[PDB]
Amino acid sequence: DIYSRLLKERIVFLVGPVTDESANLVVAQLLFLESENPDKDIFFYINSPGGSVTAGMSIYDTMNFIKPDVSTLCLGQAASMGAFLLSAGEKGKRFALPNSRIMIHQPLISGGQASDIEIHARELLKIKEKLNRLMAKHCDRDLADLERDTDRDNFMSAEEAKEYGLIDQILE
Amino acid sequence: DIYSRLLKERIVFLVGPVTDESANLVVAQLLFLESENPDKDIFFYINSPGGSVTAGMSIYDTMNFIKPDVSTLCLGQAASMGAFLLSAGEKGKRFALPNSRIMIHQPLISGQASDIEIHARELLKIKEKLNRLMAKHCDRDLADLERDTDRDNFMSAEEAKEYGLIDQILEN
C-alpha cells in the first residue's frame, strides 16, 4: 500500500504516540533500510505528541547506531519524545514544515514505601537529566539551558525550533 | 476498492474528524499523487466537522509544498479545521456543492497558574495564526476574521463564495 511505497524511497513514519510497538516498528524499518543500503540517507517523518521514554530511546539508539544518516522532518507536531527524536536527526538534515509545532518539557507521571518513592523519584530525575543533556548536545547548547527551558511546557514555532537548534531548516 | 479508482483520477477524500491518523493518510496520498505526476491537479474532497489543529496543519503544509495545484471541494460540510483546509485550496479552484455548509470559529478546548498561562498563550497563538492565515486565504482584513470567528459562524455555499472562502458553487 502507500506506506510501504513510501518505505521504498527510505521514508519512515512515526505517527501518534511513542509506544513499545510503534517504536519497534520504526526500529525494524531502520534496520531494514540499512540492510537494503547501508550508505544512503534515511528520512524519518515525525508527527507525534510523545510517549514512552524507553520506547523512544530504542529508536534513538538505533538512529545513532546504523551507518546511514537519519534525516528527520516534523509535520504537524513533534512534542516531548517526538521532539527528542526530531532533534536527534543528522545535524544539517533536521527539517520542519512551516506550520509545524515543536514542544519540549520535563518528564511527568500520573508509589509504595518512602524508600521505594525515593528510588523512583531519583530515577525520574536521572531520566530528566539524561534527556536534557542529550537534547543540549543536539542543539549545541548546555544542560542548564534545557533544564530552564523544559521546566514547563515549551511550545515553539518552526522558526523558534531552528533558532533553538532542534532543527536545521524549514522547508517551504 | 472503488476508493483506489477515485485515487487514480487524483481524488483525495477527507471524511470525518481530522486526526493524526486520517491526516497522515491524506498527506501520504498527496505525496504519492505528486510522485505519479507533479504537473496534474489534485482534487481534495472534504466532508469534515474539524479536528486536530496540528494534524490539519500537516495536510495544509503538504498542499503548499507539493508542485500540483490542490483543488478543494466541500460536500456535506466543512467546519473548523475542515473549513480551514477547504479555504487553503488553490485560489480559483475552491468549490462547494449547492447545499454544503461551511463553519469557521476560534480555537476551542475539550494545573498550576503558570501551566494554565502557558497553554492559554499557546491557544491564543493558534487563534491568531488561524485568523491571519484565513484572512490570506479569503483576501480579507485580519479584523474581519477576528470578528467573524469569535463564535461559531455558519455559512451557506453562496455566503462562503461571497466571503472569499471558496471560489465557485457547482451547479448541474
Binding site: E9, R10, I11, D41, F43, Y45, S71, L73, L75, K93, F95, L97, L171 | L31, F65
Partner: peptide, 6 residues
C-alpha cells in the same frame, strides 16, 4: 518532502 528530504 523533496528537495531535499528526499
Amino acid at each position: 518532502f523533496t528537495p531535499x528530504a528526499p
